[PDB]
Amino acid sequence: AYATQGFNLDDRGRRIVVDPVTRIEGHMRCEVNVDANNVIRNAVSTGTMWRGLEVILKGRDPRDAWAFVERICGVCTGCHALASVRAVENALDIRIPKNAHLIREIMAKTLQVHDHAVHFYHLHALDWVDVMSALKADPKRTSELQQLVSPAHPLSSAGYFRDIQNRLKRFVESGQLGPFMNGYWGSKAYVLPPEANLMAVTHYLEALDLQKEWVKIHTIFGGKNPHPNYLVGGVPCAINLDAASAPVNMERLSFVKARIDEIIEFNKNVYVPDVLAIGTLYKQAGWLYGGGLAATNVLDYGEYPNVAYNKSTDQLPGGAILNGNWDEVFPVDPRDSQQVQEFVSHSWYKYADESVGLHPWDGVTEPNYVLGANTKGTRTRIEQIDESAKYSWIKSPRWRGHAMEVGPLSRYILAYAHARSGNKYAERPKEQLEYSAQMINSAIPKALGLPETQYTLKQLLPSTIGRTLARALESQYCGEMMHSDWHDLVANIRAGDTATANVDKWDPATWPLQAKGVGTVAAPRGALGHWIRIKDGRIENYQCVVPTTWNGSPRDYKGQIGAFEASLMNTPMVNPEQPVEILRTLHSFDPCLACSTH
Amino acid sequence: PRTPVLWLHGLECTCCSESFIRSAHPLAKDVVLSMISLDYDDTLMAAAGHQAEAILEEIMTKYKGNYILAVEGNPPLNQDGMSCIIGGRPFIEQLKYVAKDAKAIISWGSCASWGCVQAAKPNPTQATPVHKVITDKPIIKVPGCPPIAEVMTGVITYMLTFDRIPELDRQGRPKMFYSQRIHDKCYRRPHFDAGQFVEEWDDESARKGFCLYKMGCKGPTTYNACSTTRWNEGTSFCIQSGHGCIGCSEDGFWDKGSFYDRLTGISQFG
Numbered sequence: 001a002y003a004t005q006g007f008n009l010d011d012r013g014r015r016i017v018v019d020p021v022t023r024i025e026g027h028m029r030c031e032v033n034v035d036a037n038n039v040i041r042n043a044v045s046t047g048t049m050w051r052g053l054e055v056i057l058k059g060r061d062p063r064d065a066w067a068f069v070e071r072i073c074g075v076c077t078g079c080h081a082l083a084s085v086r087a088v089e090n091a092l093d094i095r096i097p098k099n100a101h102l103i104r105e106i107m108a109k110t111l112q113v114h115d116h117a118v119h120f121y122h123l124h125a126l127d128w129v130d131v132m133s134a135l136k137a138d139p140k141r142t143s144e145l146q147q148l149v150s151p152a153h154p155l156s157s158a159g160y161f162r163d164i165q166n167r168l169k170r171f172v173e174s175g176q177l178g179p180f181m182n183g184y185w186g187s188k189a190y191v192l193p194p195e196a197n198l199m200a201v202t203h204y205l206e207a208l209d210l211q212k213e214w215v216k217i218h219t220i221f222g223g224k225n226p227h228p229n230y231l232v233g234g235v236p237c238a239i240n241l242d243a244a245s246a247p248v249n250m251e252r253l254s255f256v257k258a259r260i261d262e263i264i265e266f267n268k269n270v271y272v273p274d275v276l277a278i279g280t281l282y283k284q285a286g287w288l289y290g291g292g293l294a295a296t297n298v299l300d301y302g303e304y305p306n307v308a309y310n311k312s313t314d315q316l317p318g319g320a321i322l323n324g325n326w327d328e329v330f331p332v333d334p335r336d337s338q339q340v341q342e343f344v345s346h347s348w349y350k351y352a353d354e355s356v357g358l359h360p361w362d363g364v365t366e367p368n369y370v371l372g373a374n375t376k377g378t379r380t381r382i383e384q385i386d387e388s389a390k391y392s393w394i395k396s397p398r399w400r401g402h403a404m405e406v407g408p409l410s411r412y413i414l415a416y417a418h419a420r421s422g423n424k425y426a427e428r429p430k431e432q433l434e435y436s437a438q439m440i441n442s443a444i445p446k447a448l449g450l451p452e453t454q455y456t457l458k459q460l461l462p463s464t465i466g467r468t469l470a471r472a473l474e475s476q477y478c479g480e481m482m483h484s485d486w487h488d489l490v491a492n493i494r495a496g497d498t499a500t501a502n503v504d505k506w507d508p509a510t511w512p513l514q515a516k517g518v519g520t521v522a523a524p525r526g527a528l529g530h531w532i533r534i535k536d537g538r539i540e541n542y543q544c545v546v547p548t549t550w551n552g553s554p555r556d557y558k559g560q561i562g563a564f565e566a567s568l569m570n571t572p573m574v575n576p577e578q579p580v581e582i583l584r585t586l587h588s589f590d591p592c593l594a595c596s597t598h
Numbered sequence: 599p600r601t602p603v604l605w606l607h608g609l610e611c612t613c614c615s616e617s618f619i620r621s622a623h624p625l626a627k628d629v630v631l632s633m634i635s636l637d638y639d640d641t642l643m644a645a646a647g648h649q650a651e652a653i654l655e656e657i658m659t660k661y662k663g664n665y666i667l668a669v670e671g672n673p674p675l676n677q678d679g680m681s682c683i684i685g686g687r688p689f690i691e692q693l694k695y696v697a698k699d700a701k702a703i704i705s706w707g708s709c710a711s712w713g714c715v716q717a718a719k720p721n722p723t724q725a726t727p728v729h730k731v732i733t734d735k736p737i738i739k740v741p742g743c744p745p746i747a748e749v750m751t752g753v754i755t756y757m758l759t760f761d762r763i764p765e766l767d768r769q770g771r772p773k774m775f776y777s778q779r780i781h782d783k784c785y786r787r788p789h790f791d792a793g794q795f796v797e798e799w800d801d802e803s804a805r806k807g808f809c810l811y812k813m814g815c816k817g818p819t820t821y822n823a824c825s826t827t828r829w830n831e832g833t834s835f836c837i838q839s840g841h842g843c844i845g846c847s848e849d850g851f852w853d854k855g856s857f858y859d860r861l862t863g864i865s866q867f868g
């Protein structure tokens with residue numbers, strides 16, 4: 001047992017293992033210890049996959065790198081390609097044309113919306129929603145609930161809900177439950193009424209149909225989804241209005257606009273209101289657990305500048321907050337060797353000296369799969385993992401030695417802090433947050449006949465509910481932003497600027513004989529960076545530090561815990577053999593394990 | 599009774615699972631609710647840990663020799679297989695266990711079919727395609743990174759309707775989707791045929807949709823349905839949106855030189 005970061009870790013209690021953790025991307029094992037009252041008092045995050053993309057990149061052409069690293073992840077598809085082209089452009093001093101900038105932004109914001117909305121409905125919802133309780137809902141009362149939760153949503157009649165209910169009823173009564181097989185339905189961890197459950201299941205099915213429409217924006221600009229194409233120096237989708245034979249013409253741009261307008265409607269009428277309503281009801285039950293490191297330490301690189309290449313105009317302004325002090329945002333520099341560093345003290349890698357953290361320009365990825373002396377089981381049949389030694393394929397990123405949480409919640413806390421110090425670019429996230437707090441505290445309770453509460457944003461945001469909320473709000477904001485980007489793109493094209501690629505430094509004969517660069521992206525799950533060194537036209541070193549690397553990290557040399565482990569601490573489980581609360585909180589980070597390990 | 603599908607995940611990026619749910623005809627929603635019984639799938643399933651693992655035993659017993667094994671990703675052989683761990687054990691052990699009573703095996707995507715990105719040199723995990731580990735079972739390869747959504751649901755639809763694996767070419771790919779090269783029906787062919795090429799990105803030729811061969815397009819040596827069926831309900835494909843085909847459905851495409859280096863012997867493809 002030891003104390004770190006205000007947490008008292010203790011492994012004396014009953015050990016519980018969740019392997020596999022499902023409804024995530026990739027492979028994770030989670031272990032906890034619970035005390036005599038089923039409260040979590042220790043948590044262990046294990047990344048159970050590795051591919052070695054950083055190793056595979058060595059010796060290859062920097063212009064090709066985006067395609068390799070894009071395949072780090074098919075869920076956050078394209079965010080690695082963006083980081084890569086940005087990193088190479090940074091190394092080679094390439095400025096991309098305005099249209100390439102705007103098209104990349106539109107693609108990035110499309111990913112944000114698709115990733116967030118799919119995550120909530122298809123991966124997260126089943127931790128809050130009991131699908132079997134939806135069978136017992138009254139269709140009329142579900143319609144009435146729908147009209148309170150989201151008056152403007154047109155799909156709200158009693159017959160529509162009854163039809164959805166009957167299809168679910170038939171599916172269940174077949175005895176082949178499929179994805180609902182062996183679920184935790186009926187657990188006292190579930191608090192929603194039948195009507196809310198049926199509403200949520202209906203939206204699950206709606207989102208599953210709609211999500212395939214949104215990604216057609218990627219298909220237009222990048223050819224396909226998943227894994228759209230990118231380009232060092234700009235975008236491949238050349239522009240011409242006055243042929244049918246250009247990748248981008250006005251008809252293609254009008255099609256993109258129609259998809260954007262659909263996204264805006266979905267975020268405002270379905271996604272945000274569902275999360276506010278579900279969040280309100282779990283708040284009423286007192287389920288404010290899962291804050292973890294969000295209560296103290298948060299980080300983002302900052303993204304979406306109003307003016308290209310001008311970081312002061314970031315519309316999700318970044319930096320770092322420490323010790324819960326929201327009145328002070330420290331600037332974050334991905335080039336500073338004393339800021340972002342990765343340890344492997346408790347990871348399955350080797351450094352010369354594992355008492356130190358390496359900045360990614362000096363990063364090393366040498367596998368070292370070895371288990372500690374306290375392991376129960378064998379090298380190929382683990383029963384209980386030994387967290388005192390090496391226990392994960394995820395490295396341990398730290399910022400000036402501090403453990404940080406990243407993601408939409410971090411960005412929204414940063415945006416709120418920036419707004420209160422006078423940053424006007426953060427005004428919309430601030431507005432979203434204040435609106436959300438008033439809905440959760442007053443409007444929704446009053447509409448449902450529940451008592452009103454008086455939680456501040458400081459109290460509400462650092463929680464599993466807050467983390468889930470921030471994701472939904474970010475989706476909405478991203479939709480709104482790409483609507484403006486579209487208008488800027490069309491305006492720029494109509495004013496006569498059709499440029500999509502700067503090819504001045506395409507040929508490696510024009511390059512400096514050595515160079516280094518960094519590209520950062522506000523990926524759906526948080527702060528992403530790619531750091532490249534180039535020598536004689538080839539990749540000398542390529543290191544990625546990915547959002548789930550931050551959040552899912554094992555302990556560092558000092559024994560400080562990462563965001564997943566901290567967030568599970570001090571949470572009661574109704575039944576320690578049913579991991580409902582573990583899954584609810586882990587899923588609130590939207591863990592991407594292939595990303596985390598690459 | 600809907601046919602059970604046990605969908606395993608090895609080393610992967612999850613692009614295959616994502617592509618699957620983009621299907622317009624049929625909807626993935628209709629596939630899961632009305633066509634198959636998707637009884638195990640790490641990305642969507644409600645159960646976790648011990649409750650998830652117990653499903654495999656139940657389905658294999660009750661539907662012995664009558665469930666489909668779908669595999670996304672691949673098993674690593676290095677690190678004693680523990681560069682991909684499931685339930686504390688190597689993934690290769692899970693794969694071998696579930697494969698033994700399967701009536702058919704689908705290798706989804708280039709990872710399962712051939713190895714894909716993690717198998718590119720120097721392959722630090724010795725990631726190995728499914729057919730090199732499972733040698734005594736009927737396998738269908740559906741390559742591509744990822745494959746087209748309608749190709750994936752097309753294969754499922756065929757298998758469920760007919761209770762048969764469709765006719766395969768000698769590489770194990772279904773002829774109904776992988777019989778044509780991209781270059782056969784690519785809409786830029788008339789430019790290729792007239793020697794009209796993009797030489798630099800965003801040149802006048804690129805704005806007219808000229809052929810991408812000299813920019814590295816690997817369509818002349820790549821078998822897939824992208825030029826005709828296209829992507830995301832027939833919206834576009836790599837070439838239509840301006841980037842050459844990188845050859846993502848072909849075995850070992852990551853190690854066939856730079857994506858922007860042209861194929862040699864252009865007369866070959868006329």
Ligand code: NFU
Binds near residue numbers: 025072523548
């Ligand atoms: N968002 C996201 Fe990926 Ni699949 C993570 N973690 C990021 O770069």
Ligand code: SF4
Binds near residue numbers: 781843
């Ligand atoms: S016609 Fe063949 S090389 Fe030109 S598939 Fe590649 S762009 Fe079409």
Ligand code: SF4
Binds near residue numbers: 820835844
């Ligand atoms: S890289 Fe694009 S056109 Fe070639 S998706 Fe079709 S075979 Fe892969």
Ligand SMILES: [Cl-]
Binds near residue numbers: 712714715849851
């Ligand atoms: Cl391959």
Ligand SMILES: [Mg+2]
Binds near residue numbers: 054395544546598
């Ligand atoms: Mg890394």
